[PDB]
Every structure is written in C-alpha cells, then in structure tokens.
Amino acid sequence: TPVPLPNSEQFYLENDRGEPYLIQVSWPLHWEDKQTGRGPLPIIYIVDGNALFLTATEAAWRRAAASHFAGGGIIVAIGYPLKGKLYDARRRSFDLTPPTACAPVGYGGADVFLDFIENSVRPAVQARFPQVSLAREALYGHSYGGLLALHALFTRPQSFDCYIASSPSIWWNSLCILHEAKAFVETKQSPSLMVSWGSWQQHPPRWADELLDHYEARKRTAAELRMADNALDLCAMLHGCSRLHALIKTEYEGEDHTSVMSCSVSRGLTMFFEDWPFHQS
Amino acid sequence: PTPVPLPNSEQFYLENDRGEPYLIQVSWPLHWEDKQTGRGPLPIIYIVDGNALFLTATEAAWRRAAASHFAGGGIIVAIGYPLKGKLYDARRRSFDLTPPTACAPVGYGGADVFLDFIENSVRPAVQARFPQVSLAREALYGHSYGGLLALHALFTRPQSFDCYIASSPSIWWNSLCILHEAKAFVETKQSPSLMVSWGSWQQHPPRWADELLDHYEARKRTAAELRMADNALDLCAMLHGCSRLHALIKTEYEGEDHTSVMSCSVSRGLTMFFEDWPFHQS
Ligand SMILES: [Cl-]
Numbered sequence: 117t118p119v120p121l122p123n124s125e126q127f128y129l130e131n132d133r134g135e136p137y138l139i140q141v142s143w144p145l146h147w148e149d150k151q152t153g154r155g156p157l158p159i160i161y162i163v164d165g166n167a168l169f170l171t172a173t174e175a176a177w178r179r180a181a182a183s184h185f186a187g188g189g190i191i192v193a194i195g196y197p198l199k200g201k202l203y204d205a206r207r208r209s210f211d212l213t214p215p216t217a218c219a220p221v222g223y224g225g226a227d228v229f230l231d232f233i234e235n236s237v238r239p240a241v242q243a244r245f246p247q248v249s250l251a252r253e254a255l256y257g258h259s260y261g262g263l264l265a266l267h268a269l270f271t272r273p274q275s276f277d278c279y280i281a282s283s284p285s286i287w288w289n290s291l292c293i294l295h296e297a298k299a300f301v302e303t304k305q306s307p308s309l310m311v312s313w314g315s316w317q318q319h320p321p322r323w324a325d326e327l328l329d330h331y332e333a334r335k336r337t338a339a340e341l342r343m344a345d346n347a348l349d350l351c352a353m354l355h356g357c358s359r360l361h362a363l364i365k366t367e368y369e370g371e372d373h374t375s376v377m378s379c380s381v382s383r384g385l386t387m388f389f390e391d392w393p394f395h396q397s
Numbered sequence: 398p399t400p401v402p403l404p405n406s407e408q409f410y411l412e413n414d415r416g417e418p419y420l421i422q423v424s425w426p427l428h429w430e431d432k433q434t435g436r437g438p439l440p441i442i443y444i445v446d447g448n449a450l451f452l453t454a455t456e457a458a459w460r461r462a463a464a465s466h467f468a469g470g471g472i473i474v475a476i477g478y479p480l481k482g483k484l485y486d487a488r489r490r491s492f493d494l495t496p497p498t499a500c501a502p503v504g505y506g507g508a509d510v511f512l513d514f515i516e517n518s519v520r521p522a523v524q525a526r527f528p529q530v531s532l533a534r535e536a537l538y539g540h541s542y543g544g545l546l547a548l549h550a551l552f553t554r555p556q557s558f559d560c561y562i563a564s565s566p567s568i569w570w571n572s573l574c575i576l577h578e579a580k581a582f583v584e585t586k587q588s589p590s591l592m593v594s595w596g597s598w599q600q601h602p603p604r605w606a607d608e609l610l611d612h613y614e615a616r617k618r619t620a621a622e623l624r625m626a627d628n629a630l631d632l633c634a635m636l637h638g639c640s641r642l643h644a645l646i647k648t649e650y651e652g653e654d655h656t657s658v659m660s661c662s663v664s665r666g667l668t669m670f671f672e673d674w675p676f677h678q679s
C-alpha cells in the first residue's frame with residue numbers, strides 16, 4: 117500500500133550546534149544505481165526542503181522526455197524532521213535570515229546555516245556519489261529562502277555558481293538586504309542570479325464573494341510586503357554589475373505566494389541543468 | 398541513509414475488464430492524522446499519466462495549506478501504470494488517451510474503455526478507501542494525449558465529471574478529429590467546466606544555445622504542424638457562449654514548453670478546483 121520513492125534517499129545531519137537536518141537527495145530516474153552516474157553533473161540545493169523536494173525531484177524526472185535534456189542533475193532538499201507540516205517556523209526563522217542589530221531573538225543565523233551547507237551537507241552529498249563530480253552548484257530558496265539566496269550571493273558569491281531567489285522577502289527588517297546589495301555592486305568566474313515573483317503577490321485579485329474588509333486587509337498586507345517593486349528595485353540596482361554574469365528576472369502572471377513555488381523551482385532547476393551557461397546581462 | 402517515505406499517501410493496483418494493469422496513487426491533506434480524519438464533502442481530482450504528475454500534484458496540494466484561500470484541500474488520484482525507470486507507458490497510453498476513429502492506426506482508440514474503467518473501477522475503489530468522505534465534485538486532468546482525453550470525456554460524456562482540465566491538448570491528433578465531437582457537443586440540446594492551457598514555447602519555441610539553424614528550423618516546422626496554441630484558441634472560440642458549458646478558462650503560460658508547463662497546469666488545476674469552486678460564469 118505505501119508509496120516508495122525511487123532513485124532517492126534521505127539521511128539526518130547535525131550542524132555545529134547539534135540541531136538536526138533532514139537531507140533528501142534524488143537523481144535521474146533512468147539510473148539503475150547511484151553508481152551508474154559518472155562524470156560532471158550539476159547539483160541544486162533547496163532550502164525549506166520538506167516543501168519542495170518532491171516537486172523538484174519529479175520536475176527533474178519529467179525533463180528526461182524533453183528534447184533539450186542534457187542528462188539532468190542531483191536534487192538536494194535541506195529540510196527539518198517534521199510530521200504533518202512542510203515548514204519549521206522557529207528553525208527557518210534563524211537559518212534563513214541574515215544577522216542584524218535590531219533583529220528579534222531567534223533570527224540572524226544565515227551565516228551559520230550557509231557554513232553548515234558548505235562544510236557538512238555538500239561533502240556528505242559528494243560522498244554519496246564518489247564517481248560523480250560537481251560541474252556546478254545552485255542554491256534555491258523561496259520567501260525567507262530567497263532572502264538567504266540573495267544574502268549568500270552578496271556576502272559569499274564564490275559559494276555557489278547560480279543563486280535562485282524565488283519571491284525573496286526583501287521587505288524583512290526594513291530592507292536590510294539592499295545594504296548588502298549596494299556593497300556587492302560597489303566592490304571591484306562571476307555567478308548568476310535568478311529572481312522571480314508572482315503578479316498576485318503585490319496585486320492580489322478579490323476572490324469570489326470575498327467581503328471588502330477581508331480583501332482590503334490582504335491588499336494592505338500585499339502593499340507593505342511590496343514583493344514586485346522591491347524585486348524590480350533590486351534588479352535595477354544590480355544592473356550592469358561586473359561581479360554578476362547574468363541576472364534573469366521573471367514575473368509569473370497569475371501566481372501568488374504559494375502557487376509560484378511550483379513554477380519557480382521547476383524552471384529554476386530546468387534552466388540550471390539545461391541552459392548553462394546563461395547569456396551575459 | 399534510508400529510502401524517502403511519502404506520508405499521507407498510498408497506492409494500489411487495479412485492472413480494467415481487458416485484464417490490463419493500472420497503478421492507482423492516492424494522497425490526502427498532510428495535516429490529517431490518517432485517511433479517516435477526512436469527513437464531509439471533499440473535492441477529488443483524477444490525473445491520467447499518473448506516474449509523471451503524482452508527486453507534484455501531491456506536494457502542490459500540501460503547499461496550499463499555508464495559503465489564505467485554503468478550504469481544507471482535497472484528494473489527489475493519479476491513474477498510472479506499473480513502470481520502473483520512466484514516467485510514461487507509450488504503448489498503453491496511446492490506446493487509453495486517444496478517441497476511436499476509423500482511420501486511427503493499430504494501438505489507438507481506447508479512450509471509452511479507459512473512461513469506463515475510471516468511472517466503474519477507479520472511482521468506487523477510491524471512495525471505498527474514504528467511506529466517511531463524500532465526493533463534493535470530481536475533476537479529470539490530463540496532459541498532451543491526456544488533454545485530448547479530457548476534451549473527449551467532456552464532449553461525449555459531459556456528466557462524467559464536474560471539471561475537465563485539458564493541459565496542452567493534442568487537438569492536432571488524427572487530422573483534428575476531436576473538432577467533430579466538439580462541434581456536435583455545442584450544436585445539440587448542471588453544466589460542467591473546462592480549463593484549457595498551453596505553453597507559449599510549444600508553437601513558437603526559442604532557439605537553444607549552440608543549436609544549428611537547420612536543427613532549429615526542423616523544430617519550428619514540427620511546432621507549426623502541431624499548432625498547439627492556435628488549435629486551442631480555435632476550440633475555445635467554438636465552445637464560447639455554449640449552454641452545456643458553465644465556465645471556460647483558457648491560459649497561455651509565458652515561457653513554458655511541452656514538458657515544463659506540466660508543473661504549472663497541474664498545480665493551478667487542482668488549486669482552482671479545490672479553492673475557487675464554483676467558477677464564475679463563462
Ligand atoms: Cl538593523
């Protein structure tokens with residue numbers, strides 16, 4: 117009766133502080149073993165792993181039938197031990213937000229998390245595929261994950277080849293990420309950045325027989341988050357940056373905070389696997 | 398290092414009257430303690446080419462739990478085949494997803510057999526796994542040939558499902574034979590709803606890097622022949638203002654190809670059916 121997931125495995129890693137992480141890995145479906153994979157392969161790391169692993173895995177498998185298929189790559193979902201939910205609110209609050217002075221308690225642990233990914237997760241995944249070598253590495257994240265991806269690019273650009281910021285929470289802590297962006301731009305193989313967002317995030321339409329008070333509240337919230345304009349402001353700031361090879365920005369029409377995750381992660385891994393290297397910006 | 402478990406889900410094997418096997422994969426909201434947690438009316442979506450879309454549909458449904466317009470979700474049913482190392486059964490689906498015609502080659506035209514199997518075998522089997530649950534409404538999703546099946550289902554047996562979701566329907570198949578059924582559907586006589594979608598890169602594909610011009614012109618020629626977008630628009634215009642159709646929703650996904658659009662269409666498909674029902678009149 118139970119659904120067994122093929123060509124995939126999961127294991128638990130602990131960070132320096134002893135906090136546990138669920139590492140889920142998948143590889144091309146046509147593979148008989150892990151060992152069958154040989155030579156250079158791309159790899160993508162997905163934060164909030166529990167929420168995205170299956171979609172990223174299956175989307176990657178679907179590419180096998182596509183004409184522009186190059187051989188695929190390895191999916192790595194970095195998540196938490198959970199039951200009956202996709203997110204660890206407390207853990208991700210620390211792991212995904214950059215350090216600031218006025219940040220409340222339980223925030224500003226992004227550098228701890230990034231160090232963990234580079235020093236613990238990456239080597240552990242590399243060990244699972246001895247015959248495989250990493251052609252290139254991508255970091256994907258959504259919302260707070262998007263903020264982490266941007267933070268990673270601006271403070272440690274050599275860490276990953278491609279950064280995929282899905283609907284990044286630029287709003288967080290009075291637009292503190294824009295300070296790092298300016299410093300990154302003003303400083304003298306450059307990585308690539310993929311920024312995306314849904315059109316319904318900042319400009320949500322009213323539902324069927326939705327009461328006005330409920331709608332204006334969603335409108336107010338949307339206006340404050342300022343998902344589209346903050347993203348457009350960032351991209352305009354990064355425009356003509358020498359430290360960035362390519363900047364791809366996409367507004368997914370008719371997608372909201374939640375629904376866009378399907379789109380962004382699917383295109384993210386597809387372009388990284390099949391369209392590398394991207395054209396200069 | 399252990400295998401990856403899929404929680405709040407199960408699979409079982411059914412066989413049609415011809416003795417041909419099927420893998421039925423089912424999932425339900427993640428917050429549920431088990432199957433029996435579910436009570437009262439719930440929506441249910443049936444996805445053909447189940448092996449290719451079950452995990453995306455499942456996880457996309459779970460992701461909606463955090464969304465504002467969440468209303469308890471629904472049940473995902475992926476109707477697939479016993480496969481190992483691939484997502485599609487080319488031979489089986491060729492029969493199951495295409496409607497009967499006099500000119501169709503051998504191995505095609507088994508859509509009615511498949512739709513009977515879904516209604517007579519799959520639906521009751523799933524209902525039996527959730528006795529306390531009532532089926533508020535039913536949706537039939539399919540992609541490519543699956544989209545052709547969804548349209549075929551609507552035109553020949555519109556009462557079978559409440560919603561039909563045709564993702565990039567292969568209207569081109571067999572000299573546009575489906576337009577006969579659509580023509581008869583509109584020119585005769587609670588009305589169901591139809592969701593049609595396609596990728597913008599299907600009919601107008603962009604050139605790849607390091608792609609020879611000769612190779613690119615071959616892809617464009619193929620794309621022009623299949624005529625994904627224009628055939629869909631021609632069909633939607635033909636169905637517009639029809640009495641037997643409650644709502645028609647068409648979408649062109651910008652920058653999506655044949656394969657990539659599947660992620661978008663199935664995700665929005667189940668979301669709209671679960672959260673935005675009933676659709677506004679069209
Ligand atoms: Cl601060």
Ligand SMILES: [Cl-]
Binds near residue numbers: 498500501574
């Ligand atoms: Cl014919």
